[PDB]
Symmetry: C2
Subunit: 131 residues, 2 copies
């Protein structure tokens, strides 16, 4: 009855939006094991953009999140069908993944806007009137 | 065999230092229930200092932390012996609490410096040379 779920990401400056996404993946089925993949520093900076925390730091933080059962750190930057077979993964949860949908292994999850870490720094700054 | 542990705090902009502290409280004994108290907005600002996230936001974030079994939100600003009796609390874990030590109900925990949220914003800013 136990369904292996895989989610990946940078998880830089972990905030409530990441946590809500992890929870939703974990609760896709009644009985799950959620594996979370954490992207490497060199590959993230080359392909996506700047990251402030190292792989070690980003991974140590995810360890404290209730919904996380396993962590692959670093994870591969591209999910392959060999990867799914090797870790006996039943679904990938993300927010091209055409082949994942074709195989029935795709489960969508939602981003929550406005809860980010950068948003909080903006809130602190609003305390200082421009004039 | 199950030991009720109580920890309280502001938990504004939750970071790895808070998480490590919660873990340490949770692992004080083999078999624990960790209750976490979250201080109110009005009382924190009057007595400690400024807080950026509301009570609701600070509490919703703690809900995702693996070590947290129960949350009292808002918690009282001062722990009283009536409070310990009402929630059948065996130890309070903090980092005056003289009466707690006299009763054998005090367990110390450690702050981890340098992992804070404000520290990360400083790191982002170091990317911009003064000149
Ligand atoms: N969430 C950031 C985008 C991304 C996700 C997963 C991955 O393997 C590579 C990039
Ligand atoms: N960690 C901030 C200091 C504080 C802790 C607990 C409490 O009930 C009131 C203030």
């Amino acid at each position: 009855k136990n369904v292996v779920i895989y989610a990946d990401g940078v998880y830089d400056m972990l905030h409530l939006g990441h946590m809500k996404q992890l929870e939703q993946a974990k609760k896709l089925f009644e009985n799950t094991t959620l594996i979370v993949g954490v992207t490497s520093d060199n590959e993230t900076k080359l392909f996506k953009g700047q990251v402030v925390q190292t792989l070690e730091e980003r991974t140590e933080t995810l360890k404290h999140i209730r919904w996380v059962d396993e962590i692959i750190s670093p994870c591969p930057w591209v999910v392959t069908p060999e990867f799914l077979e090797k870790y006996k993964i039943d679904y990938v949860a993300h927010d091209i993944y055409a082949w994942l949908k074709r195989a029935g292994k795709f489960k969508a999850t939602q981003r929550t806007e406005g809860v980010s870490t950068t948003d909080l720094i903006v809130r602190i700054l609003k305390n200082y009137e421009d004039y």
